[PDB]
Scaffold this active site. Sequence first.
Site, PDB file in Angstrom:
ATOM      1  N   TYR A 509     -52.888 -13.407  10.446  1.00 43.28           N
ATOM      2  CA  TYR A 509     -51.923 -14.221   9.722  1.00 43.28           C
ATOM      3  C   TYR A 509     -51.230 -13.124   8.919  1.00 43.28           C
ATOM      4  CZ  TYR A 509     -49.922 -17.463   6.251  1.00 43.28           C
ATOM      5  OH  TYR A 509     -49.122 -18.192   5.397  1.00 43.28           O
ATOM      6  N   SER A 592     -46.977 -18.269  13.782  1.00 46.98           N
ATOM      7  CA  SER A 592     -46.054 -18.159  12.651  1.00 46.98           C
ATOM      8  C   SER A 592     -45.987 -16.756  12.065  1.00 46.98           C
ATOM      9  CB  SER A 592     -46.453 -19.148  11.556  1.00 46.98           C
ATOM     10  OG  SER A 592     -46.372 -20.473  12.042  1.00 46.98           O
ATOM     11  N   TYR A 593     -46.416 -16.610  10.810  1.00 45.44           N
ATOM     12  CA  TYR A 593     -46.400 -15.295  10.183  1.00 45.44           C
ATOM     13  C   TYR A 593     -47.343 -14.385  10.966  1.00 45.44           C
ATOM     14  CZ  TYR A 593     -45.565 -11.731   6.736  1.00 45.44           C
ATOM     15  OH  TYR A 593     -45.090 -10.556   6.188  1.00 45.44           O
ATOM     16  N   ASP A 670     -38.937 -26.548  17.477  1.00 48.87           N
ATOM     17  CA  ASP A 670     -39.461 -26.030  16.217  1.00 48.87           C
ATOM     18  C   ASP A 670     -38.360 -26.053  15.152  1.00 48.87           C
ATOM     19  OD1 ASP A 670     -40.574 -24.402  14.051  1.00 48.87           O
ATOM     20  OD2 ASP A 670     -41.964 -23.577  15.526  1.00 48.87           O
ATOM     21  N   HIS A 702     -43.192 -27.129  15.318  1.00 46.09           N
ATOM     22  CA  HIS A 702     -43.914 -25.961  14.837  1.00 46.09           C
ATOM     23  C   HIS A 702     -45.413 -25.967  15.098  1.00 46.09           C
ATOM     24  CE1 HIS A 702     -44.281 -22.181  12.957  1.00 46.09           C
ATOM     25  NE2 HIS A 702     -44.898 -22.610  11.871  1.00 46.09           N
TER      26      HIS A 702
HETATM   27  N1  LIG Z   1     -43.127 -21.978   5.276  1.00 43.04           N
HETATM   28  C1  LIG Z   1     -44.149 -21.129   4.646  1.00 43.04           C
HETATM   29  C2  LIG Z   1     -45.264 -20.670   5.631  1.00 43.04           C
HETATM   30  C3  LIG Z   1     -44.594 -19.947   6.850  1.00 43.04           C
HETATM   31  C4  LIG Z   1     -44.134 -18.600   6.771  1.00 43.04           C
HETATM   32  C5  LIG Z   1     -43.532 -17.973   7.871  1.00 43.04           C
HETATM   33  C6  LIG Z   1     -43.373 -18.675   9.076  1.00 43.04           C
HETATM   34  C7  LIG Z   1     -43.821 -20.012   9.181  1.00 43.04           C
HETATM   35  C8  LIG Z   1     -44.426 -20.642   8.079  1.00 43.04           C
HETATM   36  C9  LIG Z   1     -46.304 -19.734   4.959  1.00 43.04           C
HETATM   37  C10 LIG Z   1     -47.368 -20.632   4.320  1.00 43.04           C
HETATM   38  C11 LIG Z   1     -47.240 -22.013   4.975  1.00 43.04           C
HETATM   39  C12 LIG Z   1     -46.130 -21.902   6.018  1.00 43.04           C
END
Ligand SMILES: NCC1(c2ccccc2)CCCC1
Lengths: 728, 728
Positions: A509, A592-593, A670, A702
């Site tokens: 993450y 995601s991140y 998404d 997403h």
């Molecule tokens: N929207 C904040 C978050 C994120 C960050 C980068 C990409 C997708 C989602 C980080 C914490 C919850 C989701």
Amino acid sequence: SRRTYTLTDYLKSTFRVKFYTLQWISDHEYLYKQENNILLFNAEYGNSSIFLENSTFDELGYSTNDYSVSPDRQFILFEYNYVKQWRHSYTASYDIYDLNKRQLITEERIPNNTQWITWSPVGHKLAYVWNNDIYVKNEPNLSSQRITWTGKENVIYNGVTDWVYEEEVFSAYSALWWSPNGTFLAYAQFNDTEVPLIEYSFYSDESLQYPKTVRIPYPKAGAENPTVKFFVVDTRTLSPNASVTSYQIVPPASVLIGDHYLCGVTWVTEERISLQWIRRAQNYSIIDICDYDESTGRWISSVARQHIEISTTGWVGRFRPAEPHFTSDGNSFYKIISNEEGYKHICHFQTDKSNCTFITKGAWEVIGIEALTSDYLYYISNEHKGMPGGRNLYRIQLNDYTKVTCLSCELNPERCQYYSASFSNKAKYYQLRCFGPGLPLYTLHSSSSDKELRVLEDNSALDKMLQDVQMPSKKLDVINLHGTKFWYQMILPPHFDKSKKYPLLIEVYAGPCSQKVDTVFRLSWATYLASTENIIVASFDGRGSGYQGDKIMHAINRRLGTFEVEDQIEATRQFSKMGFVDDKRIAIWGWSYGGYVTSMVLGAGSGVFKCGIAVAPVSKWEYYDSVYTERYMGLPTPEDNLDYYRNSTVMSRAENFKQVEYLLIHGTADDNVHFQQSAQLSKALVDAGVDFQTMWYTDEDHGIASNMAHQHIYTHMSHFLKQCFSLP
Amino acid sequence: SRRTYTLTDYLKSTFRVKFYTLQWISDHEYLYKQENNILLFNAEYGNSSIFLENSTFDELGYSTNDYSVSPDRQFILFEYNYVKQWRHSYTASYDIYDLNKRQLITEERIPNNTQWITWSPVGHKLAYVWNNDIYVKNEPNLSSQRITWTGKENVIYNGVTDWVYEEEVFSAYSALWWSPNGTFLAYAQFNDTEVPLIEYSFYSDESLQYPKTVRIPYPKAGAENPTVKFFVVDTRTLSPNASVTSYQIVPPASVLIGDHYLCGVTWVTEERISLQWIRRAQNYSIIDICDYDESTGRWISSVARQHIEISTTGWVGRFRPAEPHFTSDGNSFYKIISNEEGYKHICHFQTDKSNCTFITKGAWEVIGIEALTSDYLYYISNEHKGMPGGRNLYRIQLNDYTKVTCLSCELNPERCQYYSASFSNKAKYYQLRCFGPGLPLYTLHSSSSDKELRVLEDNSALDKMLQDVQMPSKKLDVINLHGTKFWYQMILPPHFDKSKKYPLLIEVYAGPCSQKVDTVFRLSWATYLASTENIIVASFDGRGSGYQGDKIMHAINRRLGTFEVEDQIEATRQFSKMGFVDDKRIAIWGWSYGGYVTSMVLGAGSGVFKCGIAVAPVSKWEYYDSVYTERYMGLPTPEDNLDYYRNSTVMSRAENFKQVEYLLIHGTADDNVHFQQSAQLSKALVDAGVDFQTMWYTDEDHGIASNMAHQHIYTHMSHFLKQCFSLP
Ligand SMILES: NCC1(c2ccccc2)CCCC1
Ligand SMILES: *[C@@H]1O[C@H](CO)[C@@H](O[C@@H]2O[C@H](CO)[C@@H](O)[C@H](O)[C@H]2NC(C)=O)[C@H](O)[C@H]1NC(C)=O
Ligand SMILES: *[C@@H]1O[C@H](CO)[C@@H](O[C@@H]2O[C@H](CO)[C@@H](O)[C@H](O)[C@H]2NC(C)=O)[C@H](O)[C@H]1NC(C)=O
Ligand SMILES: *[C@H]1O[C@H](CO)[C@@H](O[C@@H]2O[C@H](CO)[C@@H](O)[C@H](O)[C@H]2NC(C)=O)[C@H](O)[C@H]1NC(C)=O
Ligand SMILES: *[C@H]1O[C@H](CO)[C@@H](O[C@H]2O[C@H](CO)[C@@H](O)[C@H](O)[C@H]2NC(C)=O)[C@H](O)[C@H]1NC(C)=O
Ligand SMILES: *[C@@H]1O[C@H](CO)[C@@H](O)[C@H](O)[C@H]1NC(C)=O
Ligand SMILES: *[C@@H]1O[C@H](CO)[C@@H](O)[C@H](O)[C@H]1NC(C)=O
Ligand SMILES: *[C@@H]1O[C@H](CO)[C@@H](O)[C@H](O)[C@H]1NC(C)=O
Ligand SMILES: *[C@@H]1O[C@H](CO)[C@@H](O)[C@H](O)[C@H]1NC(C)=O
Ligand SMILES: *[C@@H]1O[C@H](CO)[C@@H](O)[C@H](O)[C@H]1NC(C)=O
Ligand SMILES: *[C@@H]1O[C@H](CO)[C@@H](O)[C@H](O)[C@H]1NC(C)=O
Ligand SMILES: *[C@@H]1O[C@H](CO)[C@@H](O)[C@H](O)[C@H]1NC(C)=O
Ligand SMILES: *[C@H]1O[C@H](CO)[C@@H](O)[C@H](O)[C@H]1NC(C)=O
Ligand SMILES: NCC1(c2ccccc2)CCCC1
């Protein structure tokens, strides 16, 4: 000889983990849905009575996904016909059931497609948002009164958040706040008139001949943001032939300078409300405590009741500034802030004085304040054993900060190291929730004797099932990087032989204030990879991660994509040197991140990883939303941080992907990390002559959480992983 | 010992195949661009002179992709700043160069973003379309005159076709037709007001923060179609202070009944125009020959000059009805139609009589009429050796249909079996173009002595390069299916050993009236698969294919997805029984219609194919455009052919994909076979629990032809194929 935890076991949830969800409705009573029956438990005597028989849900259209009982216990709300929208938002239908005459209100019903609804804190009033406007019903059978007329799709939002406030600021769709005794109804209004629209195709059911285009006012880094207004409506004068009596509270001058956000609302008393605003930069926030003037109806603020909180090394708070917790009188409050050493602790504030006093300190952090009585303050921290990935409930005496007791630490030291808590009104009783490292355990406790009244759920059924299967083990430990100790975890295959060489899979993450290394129990995809495929799955929290002080967290300020990416590489490098890892078979994946970090790693040319999988990753920060991105990166202008915006894209590292096997996955619907991100990334790889694999998921958002998509993606990544590791 | 034809050789075109493009400008002269020089060749004496030095192109903004010399040779048009749109359409900038004063017209220039432009057949007038409106310039330096005012983006098109007419009806963007002596300018107007819009995202350059949405009026099966109008403008009265004199010609009553299309325009004389209309059903077309009435300016038609052509077993013509070829006087014409036996031959028509006389017959077909003088008629057919996949130039005496000579048959029987031809005015000379089976060969011939004046291009350079490499061989043969003989081809690996067993790749298309089996020379991806990877690549033309009579072509009428799919399976089954094929390793791939078929095969559960690749395939006919789909399937209504529309989708065969390895590829900007098609197909596979591979190509259209995407897709399919065939 036993079985291993299989992919099918995971995808089908054959191993059910039970929980215990209750709703406190007084200082000693709580409701619990059991077998579709609503039971009323009395924490004192442990005895319960039927509040609503399972035989009432039988016919309410169909499935009744949720219920909400009015505080005076005269009515109950039935939520059904649930239609999901974004992460928190959704619309639904509602029926009001009269608990006295045990009938079902049929006249003056609640609209279809209701966006939000809630009872007042007392009595049985109702407030709800429909078509972006607010309505109030003093009586379940009487006609509702319209409060706002500006509601407009994709433009004006009254009572609910727009896309960005839902996702990044409130972490909720709700934007309504009743006062303690139901006199006032406060709400926020969002204007998205000037916010650019993100658009994408939604194909829908195979029978739709033409795809429809979804449009959402979404502000990307540096774009025009939504503006906001805050109003306090006096519900006492609400009448069909009367206008709406409301007052508009504006932010303090220090915030009106430029763009800002409303990040928090807290009622203190019936005549005192607390508002927390932050500048668009997000390194300057202020709390404004407004008092009701009974002779004018105005909500007045004073410089004496304003409290500033700034950050010189980064941003304020973790994801947003922490919320204040007021005393009953409202003359003082307790709130988590960063101390002199960069650790977050509880500070005691006087409502009309600017100086505060820390009541906790140390090289650990307070996660949050859970309850507050005139004698004690309950909170959660990761102080125990100095494990940043552990959580415990603590209580501190307000008249002697020296006396602080850990209420959860020694209940089950081996099975329980990660807790959350839920207190009854006045904090007389509380439910303790243990999420690991052992099987989850729910218990009920008394605040007076700290005695454990009873076991609500111990998952003994799951325990039974699991002793019949070869489960993997989870080990937590530490390593040094740049003279700083960081934590990591490893899910080890059953019968782990520190001799043989196992393939490693890094699951990452690594975003600001993240925590992938903890003691929570999870039946995951990794459980299967270790149990059945004999793969070691590890995680590491390096620079940028949270709960270890601002020092480590703010390390990546204005430079996302650098240190947190580099630390994943160096940590993996140290893992590969431990004799039980086949350095010839190392992979990494993220969502995601984690997808961004995964991609940055693969493109670093470290030669350390053979393959990797990225799911719905960010590829270029200028494509993500303004609130989250700017919080860590500032503005993408040559005057601010454009340079670090440009050299942190995944595209700029395209050439290096020629050295690895890459799997890019993304849901075409998404709304959060737009498909654009992966479309632009793949195009850069194609232009660079890099071969890689792809996988789009039609109409998945997403989460990529539909039952069939969920099963399909994990099945697909498993084949990819096994192909890369040469596993049969 | 030599090299093999490699993937890089293919992707980079290291082996250049030369051609010879010329433009006839009289009955014995032609222009030819050589080294950026425009030379004027005299067919009679073979001598040439410089018409425009390479030193004039040097500075015209940049690259000059094309030129067009006015018929009176006084001016020349320079096309540059080319911007592609659909398959045929594009906009560009143009400069007019005065060949006399050898200057460059600077005043009253042609607009930027010009959609279409053309000189009149004589003199130096100009007509062009800009912003969907028509303009006429009598003199290169004088102001243009606006002809239409209704032009409107995505709604009204004057002088150019809308999306569907470009792709399915005209196979051109142009919708302007000057009369022989420049008196009249005819044009069509298309109204797309009621045509639904297909929308998709275009991401553009990485620097674009928000993706843009492309919108195209595209009619899918059974949807509302664009309406059309035809006008004849008298250019003699065009003047700045005068209105436009034009007449509207409407279709015959038998067509006005319901929806229809304009599929052909042909000028006969300065006072006689021929229009060909067809009903929406496309099994009824009619030719209307209109005469100009000099005393009223009207264009009159009569039932005597109308010629009907219908089909009872399918549709009219191949992709559209064949064009009429009139005599100079315009009192009669020759046109290809189906005879009693279902074979397409040339029929001689009298302009005012309904009966025609066939001048050719046999179990072969006439491909097209190339030229027509008062003594002979030149055409192309596949009669020679009874090879439907061969082409030759024939000449037939108009006063004795008995005397017909084959002008190309024996020039190079071994090297040349597939020709096309280009005649000079009055057909005194002609260029012959040989495309295989040997290296292409261009030659110039005289119509009087049938003598070969000279060799324009023989590709001797390519011949040199290829003798240094191990090229594969192409063999054509026949097999029997249902008592009917069908053709097939096989690209065999070098040093083919009928002993060993090689993996088989089936390259399919198989759409109505298609031909994958011919004698054309091609340096393709298959060349590489056979030469380097030792894979056999075969193709088969079964039921539904063309150039073999209506019997075989109309076999799939109202039932696409059945017989042509089934025949690919049975033919492959017979191929696998020939001892040199490894039944264990057989694959199939296709593009567009070939992608559909490929997918229908992989989902047939025949157990014959191990893997397959589908690029931009149709998955459900209700998603494709109305003109093409309805032509073969009728309307998707319960009254017409809904049943066969429903059971011919690829989705309905999803379960069967569990038995094969599938690769689905699609350009996200495909305006033709919308991404929707693959998005819907993949979603059905995900819902069925089928694992498969995917690959999207950002911003690539139907061709997936950008240099980098082109190289990437073939590189990607090669890895997939080699993985499936277990090839290193
Ligand atoms: N929207 C904040 C978050 C994120 C960050 C980068 C990409 C997708 C989602 C980080 C914490 C919850 C989701
Ligand atoms: C973007 O560029 C900056 C500036 O060159 C990089 O920062 C340097 O990174 C190297 C690591 O290779 C360090 O040794 C330097 O100390 C860094 N200098 C600064 C100004 O911090 C940065 O790493 C690049 N970011 C990305 C995503 O590649
Ligand atoms: C394009 O076609 C549309 C038909 O849809 C025409 O619009 C109609 O025009 C008539 C006469 O002006 C009106 O009575 C109708 O109300 C219109 N209907 C619609 C759908 O708008 C339009 O005028 C045509 N335009 C051109 C240039 O021919
Ligand atoms: C409503 O409540 C009754 C209990 O009062 C439910 O019956 C129980 O069902 C569980 C398993 O579903 C059994 O283990 C219990 O022993 C049952 N108790 C009784 C009364 O026999 C009943 O299932 C519920 N109704 C619905 C909607 O299922
Ligand atoms: C589905 O539509 C019809 C429904 O029966 C299918 O049937 C046709 O093809 C069969 C081949 O196996 C023949 O045996 C049937 O006799 C024939 N039916 C008729 C009425 O002629 C057709 O093949 C199917 N089409 C697709 C694309 O699956
Ligand atoms: C539980 O029993 C007590 C008596 O011991 C009674 O006063 C109380 O109302 C009961 N609570 C419940 C189950 O509602
Ligand atoms: C919303 O903001 C726009 C742009 O500033 C403004 O024109 C409009 O009046 C606002 N609407 C409301 C209801 O505040
Ligand atoms: C409110 O006004 C309506 C008419 O506009 C009337 O019917 C109704 O009686 C009024 N209600 C009250 C509060 O008197
Ligand atoms: C707050 O953030 C802005 C945005 O760049 C910055 O200019 C300013 O220096 C910051 N102030 C503090 C307290 O660091
Ligand atoms: C070729 O030479 C002849 C002279 O005999 C001349 O008439 C002809 O124009 C020349 N061809 C051209 C146009 O270059
Ligand atoms: C044609 O019209 C233009 C525009 O009004 C005018 O200037 C010109 O004089 C007219 N030509 C004549 C004189 O006929
Ligand atoms: C022409 O085609 C349509 C298409 O459905 C059909 O209904 C009609 O009967 C056909 N008539 C002929 C001449 O085949
Ligand atoms: C243009 O043509 C001349 C013919 O003499 C040739 O020599 C010259 O190289 C050409 N220049 C180019 C490359 O455009
Ligand atoms: N639309 C015309 C064609 C087609 C058919 C099916 C799918 C894609 C394309 C058929 C012939 C040329 C292209």
